[PDB]
Design a protein around this ligand. Structure first.
Ligand code: PLP
Ligand code: PLP
Ligand code: PLP
Ligand code: PLP
Ligand code: PLP
Ligand code: PLP
Lengths: 295, 296, 296, 296, 295, 296
């Protein structure tokens, strides 16, 4: 019920933007998604700095001036959670946007506001596995929108995918890029396992560089699971020994069906999903530097 | 401070606001319109009001947004909005349809849109005497990725990249090529060239938004005996053009007097079409008076 | 059993078989056709027989398949197959041209095709009252990679991908975009929209098979005074259409009442085209009697 | 005559036929394989049988074809077909999976495939000393349109287009670029170049079929210490290569000595890979004895 | 043996450019091809002004400054032919290029030279019909080079096509554009006949706007042959009742074979080829305004 | 006035000229090189001379030009050329291979190239302290249209469009994206970014020319313990880069201190690599002395 907004905690109901904002009207903003986990002993924010660092990278990429440092945004999160006394699982949404009414597309020199909402949050995707479908919509291409930024207007594309998959009776979309390579869910990175090797599409194929994908790559290297950042085709998805989605909201979600073709809820996925939970729960000493305690 | 219509009710512009958690703000899921009203001394006339509100609702059906108002209801809303502020001068009117619920999930199914209508004084968006335009590096977003024929909010991040690129680098406005490298639009305007006495404008299928100012030019070209072809334009046809201009609601009819440093005359067809458009919007052409909604 | 024509002989349908090592089976090097015959109560009329057989032959020359029969021969062979079976009811007739020799090598030069022609009882392919369609993830196979204008066997793996994708979700049919992102085909049907009183169909160049039902529809539109444009269609124009329908030999004229959840009316143009097509194929339009081949 | 396996029965090759109305014939909905057996003087060894049968099954699941046999079953069925025929010489074995039911409809869901397996005497597919290749006008069919990694029947119309184009001019084989312009395939072969001591082959994602000869070559390179990169190949890198060769079950290891008139040496890497492959398939490499299935 | 060069007639051997010219080194020039026909009574230059007008349009498109008007270039042609006393069929090559040595790619402000050579010339293509082949090379695309200009560096693409077709045992190439639509020969526009309707690809498909194509469109309209400027696919080429190439050098050349598929030497082509010859020969009064007499 | 080598003979630069009818001038059919020599006080050293001349000949084989000289002969020619002018200062050397015959026909088969070599004093092509770069509207020409890995003359019309666009609009240099919109080159330079301590440069397959200055940077990065990845770069990775630089023979190692108005530090890796390159070319690193051809 308290939300941070430009350096102040305000009630939920005052964290609002004019309807003439070019952020609303032109998809001109950036956002982030950050989890905090309650383990019974504390509340820990997962990879806080890395997210706020990417928030600012996203802004720089789309030419939005965010007048806060990653440290002051990081501090604001913790202060936003303390203000509300939350001792439970949360999703945290920072969003950067223009506060002023403006009809002109010329946004040079404008200065973003940032708001930080923390809300109680369970599971995005079914933990025992989802049914996925390749959609008709392709991922917006680097030549038209800067897709490595988590920029707000891009997610129209993501919405068309998420809705198509869902109206068609599946749990989540898979999007192919302009060249036809599997790249992303609607908000998720994607991993396959092919003969004991983990594959995820490289930065250049049009993906957003996920922090949960990054954690997955570290987990792999700890576990000695050979991993490649390599383009994935539909056919390799269809023929996968295992497949899974990753993201802040999704966590580690097995994909047990692609376009009607059943996939094993496999062992590589289970080992990653298990170790990711131990990590966020603060049960792996080595990865404690990524947990920010709130109390 | 102005009154703004918001879901049926007139509120101060300071109250026409939406939660920062709205999937509209966060994920560019909304639609919008641009509509002018013109003061002619006698009355305030809103231009092609019904056509714009029908487009709002087509935009919305294209992106799967549920707007719970009719075109007639929206059109009345604009009239009530301008009146309650007693404006008697030129206005730009912005209808914006968006989700006023906080929602983190991308699954926007089932949600019903809000609609705000702001009417503001305004203004010429472009230099009447003409603009210098650049072909930008950024490609116009493609139909296979976003439904670009909707005036949908998220798509404009593409326009912004364009508009900033042109301006930052010296120019007044961008020209964007499609994925197949044909000329398609400005950043918020449709484009016309005149080649050998023939008007050319990119067709619907190339990636444009179907402009109402575009449509009006096509009617004007017919009144005036100027041949018109909805036909793909290449960057070479731009460079060689005898005349070029932008059109749109804010833009009106704006001559392009330079493309990538190559100079264009402010030409006779452009001026004829600009001149007629002004007659039309000011209520001086009988035939077009059903396009004008009087406010008072 | 029922008799089937195979290389100039009427054989029982159990003998109408081809070695499993044919390069037509193993590499999709064949052509086919789809032809209907309709019983009007007096006689059984085969609809545009010669046009279908001419097109089989164009399909072959396109792919380099050597069909040792003329259009006229194949046309007569149909008429005898129907007669042999004593059919007095609506049929779908399938001419299939393919290699009867076993051959592992991809070098199919100089081989000579066989032709088999089967006539089968057949009602409707899609719901008469209208079908729900989904734009699929599969794009239409591109001209740069196979000769899509030919009705060629190996191409239809793409059509099956699309057809199954749509039906696996309980939609009735697929719509497929071409590589450039424009609507082109159902899995086995040409597509028409109505948009502001104008009938639009993707043009030849977009990657369609040149349907003969399509061609009929184009003649009927002229007869009826309906303005018609062969122009690229986007997904946005489909979503926003006033009406939409599929056409094909098996499909006839089927209204599209849903596309990606967006409802479309079963419209007046589609109805009037459906009703006129029906009267043509039953012999009730005297100008079209030349398209109707009597069997008895 | 020679015996062929058809659905768990050894039949004479004249009975190994399929109705001409199968959707496998009419719509290219099938999968196949190519497997060799080699006579070394002591025994006939089938080369990587189980890997080929595993891949048949992956090909089917990719296309949604229901093959009611396991890899192991099909593997044994091969061994019996060879034995039935008393062959004691080099063979090409063709497993073909396809629908034995007649069906006009594109909805192939839930149908159950038949499998036929033929074993035929077979020498060389391409000149041992090297072949002249042409980059063809036809591009490899794209993943967005068919599932190229599957060895699926309907895809090979594209391969025939390419194969015929090259051979019509008296070249021995085709090279095909993918949609993005990168070298991917011969008509029926994977491609390798040597460029400055490094063996390069297009990668999985580029649109290739994952050849088992390709996979062997990759194991042999590791054995031999030859640095290997799976990276996209341009036409320029082919023209400029130190060496080039095609690989495939039928092709074995064939040097490419001419591409678009540009001469290439019959090189040392290609020779050493060819010689090692030969020794592997004859049972003279003890580490690879697990890839060799004895028939007798 | 006399050639015009920057306002002077010089012998063939002095019409030369430094090897360090950025025109030679970077394909930065424009050119034209113009015929003159000897009819026994005079020598007439076909559509001289229209060609010199396009020369200048080409330069303007690639940003080459040509300091002559179309009229002065037109005059120079006639003066170049008179100087040589030619009374026979000629091809005329105007080429505009940079005279200065320069390694920098920055050609702004440079000022072209123009040279005008007139040479005796027979037939480019076999008058009774050619065998054509679709090539592996695609026409350079409008997004990379301004292909509506007859600019010199572009013709590398054309060369790769012409050579491929020719090394493969055919008479001429057919090039498909980036989208796969038939657009051009290596130096020729292309026409098909489909059920009595003439089709040629539109300006936008990547073609150069040929003057011989334009004459063909006028001839069609005189003859009441219905004509469409419409995209052509390979399949429509394969299934054509007739096909032909047009260009200054090619004239009207039937295409009697495409990729092994025989085409009729048809009647629409013959009527156009016949009327084009009557035209250039000065036997059609109506089209006399396009012939410039030399004597 | 300088002596220039021309087909084996030394002539005054005024005589190193070619007919205006040459298919090289008219149709961009030729190849070229850029090579430096560096005065170090002790001698004049030509840098990577043999490597550049081998590239000339690869360029030529790629475009089908017949250059009738060996790499060794060309390399000697450069040495003889610099000597005959007695230069003892920094030079740019331009070899250019072209057709000295007048030929109107595009069929260039059978013709033999001439080669001229000019050696000229020069010069820094770019601001040592750094350049401002723009992403241009023009796409880098594609492999499916021209053999862009050849340093072929006609391709540069693309570079010129780029270079003029950047410069005309304020900037020092262009950056061009490929057809697939990945970052590929400057107008005559290869590009490097530094992201999180890692050097990145677009790989061979994306459309670059394989620069010798590029190769030298890859060797330098190895000497210096700086990790390097030949890997596609997106415009977002450019914008976010910690450092960026151009490399090429004329360019040397040029920092990029602005990309599309976004400011970059003149960074530490760039400076380290620039510094080493200068040591290398001036004969101060023993290991690289086989790269230096002494003139005297
Ligand atoms: C946010 C996002 C992801 C997931 O990233 P995390 O940092 O792991 O939450 C994946 N793909 C896209 C398109 C996204 O926007
Ligand atoms: C709104 C808009 C136009 C202009 O439409 P009008 O109806 O004339 O105001 C043109 N192009 C784009 C991209 C637009 O959003
Ligand atoms: C056969 C076919 C049609 C319809 O053609 P008709 O002759 O009208 O039956 C349409 N599309 C495709 C892809 C086809 O194969
Ligand atoms: C079968 C095939 C190959 C070669 O695969 P192998 O298993 O090595 O015989 C290569 N390319 C394509 C297109 C194929 O169909
Ligand atoms: C010159 C040219 C033509 C033919 O034009 P004409 O003006 O008829 O000589 C056709 N195509 C291209 C690519 C050309 O350069
Ligand atoms: C010549 C060239 C370079 C630089 O090559 P160097 O061998 O380093 O001089 C880079 N890019 C392009 C396009 C070039 O022509």
């Amino acid at each position: 019920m308290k939300v941070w907004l430009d350096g102040r905690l305000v009630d939920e109901e005052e964290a609002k933007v004019t309807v003439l904002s070019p952020s609303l009207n032109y998809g001109f903003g950036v956002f982030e998604g950050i989890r905090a986990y309650w383990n019974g002993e504390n509340l820990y924010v997962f990879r806080l700095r890395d997210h706020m660092e990417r928030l600012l990278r996203s802004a720089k990429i789309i030419g939005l001036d965010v007048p806060y440092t990653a440290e002051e945004l990081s501090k604001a999160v913790v202060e936003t959670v303390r203000a509300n006394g939350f001792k439970e699982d949360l999703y945290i949404r920072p969003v950067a946007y223009i506060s002023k009414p403006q009809i002109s597309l010329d946004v040079r020199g404008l200065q973003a506001s940032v708001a930080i909402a923390a809300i109680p949050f369970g599971k995005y995707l079914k933990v025992e596995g989802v049914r996925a479908a390749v959609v008709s919509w392709r991922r917006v291409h680097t030549s038209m929108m800067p897709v490595m930024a988590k920029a707000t207007g891009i997610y129209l594309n993501s919405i068309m995918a998420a809705v198509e998959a869902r109206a068609r009776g599946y749990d989540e979309a898979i999007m192919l890029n302009a060249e036809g390579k599997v790249v992303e869910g609607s908000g998720e990175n994607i991993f396959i396992v092919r003969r004991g090797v983990l594959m995820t599409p490289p930065l250049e194929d049009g993906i957003l560089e996920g922090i949960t994908r990054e954690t997955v790559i570290s987990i792999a290297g700890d576990l000695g699971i050979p991993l490649l950042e390599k383009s994935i085709t539909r056919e390799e998805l269809y023929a996968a020994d295992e497949a899974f989605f990753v993201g802040t909201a999704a966590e580690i979600t097995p994909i047990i069906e692609i376009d009607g073709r059943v996939l094993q809820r496999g062992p590589i996925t289970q080992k990653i999903a298990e170790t990711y939970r131990r990590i966020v729960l603060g049960k792996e000493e080595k990865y404690l530097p990524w947990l920010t305690p709130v109390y």
